[PDB]
């Protein structure tokens, strides 16, 4: 019984951990893209400020 | 070993529940940033007029 319950632990944890491995890089890339988009918005607002100065 | 099993399974199902929420939240944040970009383009058109 001990060996089979340990096998169950093994498979459960390995599956969930590979799911986490798949997930995390997606979040990292999403945050990087969000920061890039915020920088783009900053540039747009600087252009707006130049327009207002003109 | 049973204690290890239950602890790790519980925490791992918690992580499973959590992560998709973060993914959806980031997608919605990016969509909202795109909406802000469109609003600012409309502002620029107003300023050109």
Numbering used by the authors:
A (entry chain B): 95 to 148
B (entry chain A): 100 to 148
Question: Which statements did the authors publish about this structure?
Answer:
In addition, Bt secretes to the medium numerous vegetative insecticidal proteins (Vip) that have been classified into three different families. Notably, members of the Vip3 family have shown to have a broad-spectrum activity against Lepidoptera4 and, since they target binding sites different to those of Cry proteins in the insect membranes, they are considered a good complement to the action of these toxins. Vip3 proteins are synthesized in an inactive state, as protoxins, and they require to be activated by proteases present in the midgut tract of the insect. To shed light on some of these questions, we have determined the near-atomic resolution structures of Vip3Aa in the protoxin and activated states by cryo-electron microscopy (cryo-EM).
We therefore decided to solve the three-dimensional structure of Vip3Aa after trypsin treatment. Activated Vip3Aa shows the same domain organization described in the protoxin state, and domains II–V maintain a similar global architecture. Domain I, however, suffers a large conformational change that remodels the apex of the pyramid into a ~200 Å-long needle. In particular, three antiparallel N-terminal helices (α2–α4) undergo a set of rotations, in a manner akin to a folding cane, to form a long continuous helix that assembles into a parallel four-helical coiled-coil in the digested Vip3Aa tetramer. The cryo-EM analysis shows that the coiled-coil is relatively ordered starting at the beginning of α2 (~D45), and that the flexible end is formed by the most N-terminal region of the protein, which contain the residues forming the first alpha helix in the protoxin state. Close examination of the structure of the toxin revealed that the coiled-coil of Vip3A, which resembles other four-helix bundles such as the SNARE complex (RMSD of 3.4 Å for 232 residues), extends ~160 Å and that the average internal radius of the modeled section was 1.46 Å. Interestingly, comparative analysis of different structures, like that of the Sendai virus P protein, have shown that hydrophilic residues found in these positions—known as N@d layers—can bind ions and water molecules in the central cavity of the tetrameric coiled-coil. Although the resolution of the cryo-EM reconstruction does not allow visualization of water molecules, there is a clear peak of density coordinated by four symmetry related asparagines (N163) that, based on the buffer composition (5 mM MgCl2), was assigned to a magnesium ion. Domain I is indeed retained after protease digestion and stays tightly bound to the core of the protein through interactions with domain II, forming an essential part of the active toxin. Notably, the coiled-coil observed upon trypsin digestion forms a 160 Å-long dipole that can accommodate small ions in the inner cavity and, therefore, the dimension of this four-helix needle would be sufficient to reach and pierce the lipid bilayer.
